[PDB]
Amino acid sequence: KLQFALPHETLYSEVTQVNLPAKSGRIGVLANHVPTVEQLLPGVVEVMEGSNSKKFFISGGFATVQPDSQLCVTAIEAPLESFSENIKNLLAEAKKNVSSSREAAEAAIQVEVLENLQSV
Amino acid sequence: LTTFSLYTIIVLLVITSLYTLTNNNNKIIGSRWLISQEAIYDTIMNMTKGQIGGKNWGLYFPMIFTLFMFIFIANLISMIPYSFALSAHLVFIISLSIVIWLGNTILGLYKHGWVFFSLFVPAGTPLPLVPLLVIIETLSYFARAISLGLRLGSNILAGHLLMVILAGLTFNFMLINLFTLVFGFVPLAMILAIMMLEFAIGIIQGYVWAILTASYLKDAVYLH
Amino acid sequence: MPQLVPFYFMNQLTYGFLLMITLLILFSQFFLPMILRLYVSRLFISKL
Amino acid sequence: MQLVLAAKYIGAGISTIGLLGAGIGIAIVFAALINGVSRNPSIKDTVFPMAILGFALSEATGLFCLMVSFLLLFG
Amino acid sequence: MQLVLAAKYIGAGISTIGLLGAGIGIAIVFAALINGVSRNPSIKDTVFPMAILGFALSEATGLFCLMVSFLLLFG
Amino acid sequence: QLVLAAKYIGAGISTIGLLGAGIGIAIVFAALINGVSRNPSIKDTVFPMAILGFALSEATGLFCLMVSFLLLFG
Amino acid sequence: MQLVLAAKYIGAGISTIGLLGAGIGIAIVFAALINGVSRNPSIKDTVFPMAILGFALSEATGLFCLMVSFLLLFG
Amino acid sequence: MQLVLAAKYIGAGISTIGLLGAGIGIAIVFAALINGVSRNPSIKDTVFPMAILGFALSEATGLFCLMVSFLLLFG
Amino acid sequence: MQLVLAAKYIGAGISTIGLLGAGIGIAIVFAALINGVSRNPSIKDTVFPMAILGFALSEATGLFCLMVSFLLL
Amino acid sequence: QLVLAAKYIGAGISTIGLLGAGIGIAIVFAALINGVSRNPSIKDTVFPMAILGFALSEATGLFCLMVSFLLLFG
Amino acid sequence: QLVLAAKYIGAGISTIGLLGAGIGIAIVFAALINGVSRNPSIKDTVFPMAILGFALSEATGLFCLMVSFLLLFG
Amino acid sequence: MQLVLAAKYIGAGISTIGLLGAGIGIAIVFAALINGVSRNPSIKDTVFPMAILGFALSEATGLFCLMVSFLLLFG
Amino acid sequence: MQLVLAAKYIGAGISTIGLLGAGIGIAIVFAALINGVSRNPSIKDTVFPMAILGFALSEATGLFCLMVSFLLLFG
Amino acid sequence: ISYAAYLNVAAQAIRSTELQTASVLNRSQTDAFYTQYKNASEPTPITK
Amino acid sequence: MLKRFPTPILKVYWPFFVAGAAVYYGMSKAADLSSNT
């Protein structure tokens, strides 16, 4: 079972195969899995129910396989196609931001986010 | 004539046929056979743009393509079970390797002066062992000279020699008493497994040639 | 091994370097640009 | 000649030692395959060709030992 | 003569050393299987075919070694 | 004489082969323990896997052993 | 006479080499025991009989080496 | 003379042992490739050139070894 | 005479090789002990008996090699 | 005769030294591949360090090889 | 003089045994550094534990060394 | 004379074995350098001089071995 | 004697093999140092002295092997 | 930069494509003043 | 089927061809030396 809930939505809140991108690379959960807690990095996420696959762009969060086979995914915001050009313009602004100043870290996250979006 | 000359002609004739009757007079849609030579084009395009990428990357793209295709065909022709191995005349493959290696060394010296040997200072280190790190970098630099040739050479030589010696053993295994002839097919199957592996490792070695003498050419074309 | 040693090395090498120069010209001028025709044509149909 | 022939048969055995490394080698590649597939549940389409490449290359090093072994043993 | 007969028995022994490598290899593949299946308890149906493939290939290097041992033993 | 000497030497050499098998058995058992501690609950699935792995690891050792004996006795 | 007796002593010495692998093996099982028990605090009752089993099997390979050593020494 | 020829073929056998190292090495590079890819699917295109580069360089030591074997055998 | 006494000495030298395995073995046990204890902070009282047991068994293998050396001497 | 034999035997034994260098080289490249997959972006810093590491590991293997040639030819 | 030759040969072989202990010593100390870096705080318990292992690993090598001296003297 | 000269050459060859450990040694240090630097992105200024120290020290044992090899060979 | 002087040179060569273990050992300590420092960022003030201690005894095991080599070699 | 701050900036970036609803844009707007206090005494209020 | 487009970068491959000539000459001497004992 998968429970995917966000502070403004409830998505998948069983689910056949789920692929999640975590600070440990990528983790896939199918049935029982070891009941770890792993922090989700800014991500492209796929959730598959049967063979049907739905693709989510996930802002990072935390993932926890519960020892009862409940995949708790919580993250700040997301479908993938909806996120998708103007942001590519925005990264140019963000590059400028790296130059001036906390803003560096912010802009670094922005570089990660454009890169991740360009990746898909 | 010379056996070597006759098989070089056979290689030339194999290579011609792949671009003169494989295709349907250059049909845009693409023929099943012509799809093969498209994929070869793309994987060396995308490989040699990746290796010797830079302003010039396509200027040595024909050379890396005919170094692919020569070895790619010569590791199929040399594996026919009654054929004269051009490649297992190691001296031609090794001579070709030394030629490309010297033609990199000369190209590098010409393009990047006598400060070409600054390539063999790879990293900042205290100055009294900067020259040391040139000696035991250059030693390895012309170990690449013989590695590139001997890699391919060993692969081809080992395949034919392995198969023929085991073939000779299994011939005499089936030439003795028939109860050993029964349950004597399993060593033949071992030669079959080796032959399956030898075709695979020959195409893999041909790709490895062309990436490595792209890597040496990367060094020669772009100093560091 | 005598099957890997002829003394005909320079003979071999003559026919060998001839095949290399032949294939180099042959690919470069003939067979490589006829693949590039397929590509450029495909892209021209794509534009129109 | 008896000395040289005995030297061959001993030397053949010596060459056989080289195979041991390849045996461990095959395993190292397959261990990675199993581990990786366990990580993703899904990487396997990408990784399985990589495993085949890996098997062939490791095995090839093994064959070099085998051909030297047979050069002494038979040859 | 005595030298040749000795050489067969010596060379056989030397060959046997090689087999040790394959043994370690086999274990490594199984180790990956156990750990892998532990990490995702439903990976087993995919992974178990892969595991048997890895076993067989690792074992094969051992087989070639043991063949050379028997060739020296009886030749 | 020399031929009989060669039997005793040959046997000795073969005994070296056993070292690998010893390491092998252990590697499988290490994985069993690691696996059990890792899942808490894989144990019923993993136990038949472990037995299989033990047997195969051991088998390579057995081949080394029989060659050792074979050179000694005959 | 002298040669055969000499050979027996040498062969016994060679046989000890086999033991080295069993030593490393035992350690590997025990390391796993320590690591597992430290990971769970609670697996220990299940894991301890497994550990004893693994010890015995690993040890047993070394035992095989020992009996062969005695056989060569004594003849 | 026979001693020289004997020694040549013995020496050949001895050199072959070196190859085992390269076989394990080749496997180690491929193990890294499989693990890296599984840990990040998007890395794959960057990593694949580096993997082949590493394979060759690893292999090269084995080819040096093999060349000594061939120097003795053919020469 | 000479050959047999020589052979005994040679055989003894060879016997040391078995000990190397034990040396590594002991280290692996102790490394594990340190790792476990550093991971848990508190496993140590359960683990320390286990560690001593593992040490002894590893050492015992080396002892077997050593006594065979002594027998040849 | 015996001297000629000795240099050939010694050449064989010396070749074994290469074994370690092959493992060494692979460990450097392995760490490179692992590192780049871990960071996504370390590679610019790490790649010079990796080439340095390759050279030093390889150099040890070349020491083995030159000793082999000093025996064999010399 | 064959016996005297044999003493010297045996001695050389005896050094091989020491190699394992040398690696072993480092492995224990590696664990120490790892543990200490993980906790910052385990260190006061662990440093004694480490020293116990350090000595023990060394002792195996001492046995090998002792056999070398026993051979050398006879 | 012949035996003594022979013994120099044989002794040199045997000595060359030891060098291998130092080769592996350099790699173990460099592996840690790469791994550490990949973990932090920023440890590197401390870690790089530590690594060069580690290289030199690991190498030193190898160099002692190389000295003995030369002493046997030339001396 | 010829045999005795030969045995000194040969025996020395064998003695040199021991150095390999120390080389790998030293590298492991420095690897652990780099790993630890990269893990903590800041442990180093305590840990660097510890690393020198671990280095020292690992090195010492090598020096023992070396000293046996010197004894045989020099006489 | 706290862990949740790290995620926060990423989330803000994700609202950048332009097809997005007003409520999304409203969730990115904020208005607050962290007014520090001590002892009674009040160090000055300043926007988040 | 076929078409011809000259690729003029054969004069960029001048050190490669020069190396071929040198090795060609050297192999003449090598072949003569190998046809001798």
Automatic annotation (TrEMBL), chain I:
TM segment ranges: 12-34, 46-73
Gene Ontology MF annotations: hydrolase activity; lipid binding; proton transmembrane transporter activity
SUPFAM superfamilies: F1F0 ATP synthase subunit C
Entry keyword annotation includes Protein biosynthesis: no
Localisation per UniProt entry: Mitochondrion membrane
GO biological process, alphabetically ordered: proton motive force-driven ATP synthesis
Descriptive protein name: ATP synthase subunit 9, mitochondrial
Organism of derivation: Saccharomyces cerevisiae
Taxonomic placement: Eukaryota, Fungi, Dikarya, Ascomycota, Saccharomycotina
Gene that encodes it: atp9
